[PDB]
Design a protein around this ligand. Structure first.
Ligand SMILES: C[S@@+](CC[C@H](N)C(=O)[O-])C[C@H]1O[C@@H](n2cnc3c(N)ncnc32)[C@H](O)[C@@H]1O
Ligand SMILES: CCN(CC)Cc1ccc(CNC(=O)c2csc3nc[nH]c(=O)c23)cc1
Lengths: 237, 239
């Protein structure tokens, strides 16, 4: 009955408590908006040492994940999905960088089977055969795909209806009015509810321009927001 | 220990995912990593005031107070000792983390990471105490705990003894046993070639895969004579 079924293929399923016990994903799991199941490839091995790493063909340092244990856990995950259209995602640095655009696309799916790789990664033929899409969470290399898998689940979950632009946010201020010789901008303490809306929007635009100008090349600035940005750039030291 | 990490988060027990598992866990055991947590809620004035307060000027949502954060931070600073500690705020508004930044962060002796929730943080605390602001990518998460864990993991691989985007290129494909799987056979160069044939093929595959998937990384990185030939040969023979 859940609006998104997620199956995670990982040798560390305990690690995923970070999303099952905490936050919006945890809430969604309880509310039944998200079914979160794990599939340890180690419980699909033929030896007592639960060996899941194989040597690489052509030498070189590192290990490759063993194909048969992965095959097992994937088949089992596919089985539990039922009649749901399940997209198989491999979390990989070589994948399509995840952006909110991709998150919206992934949120439209009814089932997601996420492969959390380890060591040097998973065999190319295994990808070629089973994987539907490859995603990266950013241009940095991590030790495994469990944290990227959890990041993907969290990002998509917020979009699931009931769980809860291209412009950075405005700065935020809370109690006290003055702290360590630093005072809250007057516009917030004494100002119109449309002039606070004005200032916040102007700060949003300005901070985006200052830090993430690329997000503004993508965006198409309106008349109203170009004037507030011009005001920001000119009213700045 | 080699590197000292202190995490300022309202969910300190979430960090069990990196302290108990993988390379980071190994590093903590081996004594290369020192992982500590600092809950801001155990620093309020009264145990009645929440960590989340109201935003000045109205609007929807909540903000994180300066005092609870300031307490945890001054305390985290104390435990670092004589170590030069860089204070990082994990935020979507920060500049995007790349392997370049990871290498820079790995050179540090101590790191104090600030994880916030969906609520903002009072700008004055940032202005005053934060040394760097980092984002893990252009997507919205509920909080900075997973980005904090991602930062710690990325950095700990670089710590000597614990064990794409290295040379600005993606990686080559990988193949393991069996020689033939699902009617697909391991490229001969790996089964029969020498250690020079293999280097050349792997480099050609890394170039080709980068060109195919992340052409932007190639606009940035300049291509050499040997590389352009390996890439031309990749493009022209791909099909
Ligand atoms: C040592 S890393 C990748 C090594 C190498 N670049 C490769 O994939 O051939 C091992 C695993 O961590 C995951 N991973 C690492 N960095 C990632 C990132 N930036 N985004 C998503 N997954 C990542 C993937 O599941 C990958 O198979
Ligand atoms: C209070 C302002 N929020 C909009 C109502 C903006 C906002 C703040 C904090 C978050 C939570 N994000 C992080 O803590 C975070 C920390 S690092 C990071 N990297 C990529 N994406 C991220 O969401 C993050 C999300 C939105």
């Amino acid at each position: 009955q859940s609006m998104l079924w997620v199956g995670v293929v990982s040798i560390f399923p305990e690690m995923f408590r970070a999303i099952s016990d905490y936050g919006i994903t945890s809430r969604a799991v309880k509310q039944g908006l998200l079914t979160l199941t794990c599939w340890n490839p180690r419980v699909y091995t033929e030896d007592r040492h639960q060996t899941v790493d194989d040597r690489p063909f052509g030498g070189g340092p590192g290990m490759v994940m063993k194909i048969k244990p992965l095959e097992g856990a994937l088949a089992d995950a596919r089985q539990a999905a039922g009649g749901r259209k399940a997209k198989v995602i491999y979390l990989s640095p070589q994948g399509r960088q995840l952006t909110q655009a991709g998150v919206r696309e992934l949120a439209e799916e009814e089932a997601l089977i996420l492969i959390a790789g380890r060591y040097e990664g998973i065999d190319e033929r295994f990808i070629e055969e089973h994987v539907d899409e490859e995603w990266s969470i950013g241009d940095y290399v991590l030790s495994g795909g469990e944290l990227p898998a959890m990041v993907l689940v969290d990002a998509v979950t917020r979009l699931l209806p009931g769980a809860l632009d291209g412009l950075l946010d405005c700065p935020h201020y809370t109690r006290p009015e003055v702290y360590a010789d630093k005072r809250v901008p007057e516009v917030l303490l004494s100002g119109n509810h449309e002039h606070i809306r004005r200032w916040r929007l102007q700060q949003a635009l300005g901070r985006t321009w200052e830090r993430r100008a690329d997000l503004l090349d993508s965006r198409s600035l309106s008349g109203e927001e170009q004037k507030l940005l011009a005001e920001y750039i000119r009213q700045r030291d």
